[PDB]
Curated annotation (Swiss-Prot):
Family stated for the protein in its record: Belongs to the metallo-beta-lactamase superfamily. Class-B beta-lactamase family.
Known regulation of activity: Inhibited by captopril stereoisomers and iodoacetate. Also inhibited by chelating agents such as EDTA.
Domain of life: Bacteria
Coiled-coil boundaries: none
Binding site for substrate: 159, 168
A UniProt-annotated Pfam family: Lactamase_B
Organism of provenance: Bacillus cereus
Protein name according to UniProt: Metallo-beta-lactamase type 2
Subcellular localization: Periplasm
CDD domains reported in the protein's UniProt record: BcII-like_MBL-B1
Alphabetized InterPro entries for the sequence: BcII-like_MBL-B1, Beta-lactamase_class-B_CS, Metallo-B-lactamas, NDM-1-like, RibonucZ/Hydroxyglut_hydro
Amino acid sequence: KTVIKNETGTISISQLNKNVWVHTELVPSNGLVLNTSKGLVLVDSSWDDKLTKELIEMVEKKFQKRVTDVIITHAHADRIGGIKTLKERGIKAHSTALTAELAKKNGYEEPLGDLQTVTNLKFGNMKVETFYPGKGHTEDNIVVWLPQYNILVGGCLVKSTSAKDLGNVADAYVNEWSTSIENVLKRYRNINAVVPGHGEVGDKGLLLHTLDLLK
Ligand SMILES: [Co+2]
């Protein structure tokens, strides 16, 4: 897989696919860059505004298209933190209503609150499904599915192999997280890659790992 870094090793993009890339910023945090016929779409932005601006500028320059949309997978900072940058640049920031409600409560600018339990979006030819599986890492966590690739973005709901515990559980629902993981396994029975919130890309084994960490 082709991999491209900025000057610092602070931001790195790894090609999963002709049109799907994983972005990682330095903990490392992951999201996706979707190279579509109508622009770039990000699944998650970055830790804060400084890194979000750098991420956008890197990908706009490389791919020679604008970032048009971001999907925010929960209302914590590794996730909501670049919202000011998105809003001021006219980048549409999609989220569930609950994620937007939580962002506002916590003093962040609000994403759109447009995503339902299951939402199907199309960006050029790129199909994206968002799914709220229930509570887990947070109340509001969603996953994102690319049905043309059978790629799942697990976000913080899904732990990497290298994670040997659940991490920050202060906002977690450790008794509903296993059911939520089961909901993802039931919906998506044939998965090619799973992108955890943090750590190396894997497959359905990451979901099984997360289940074991919850015991
Ligand atoms: Co989080």
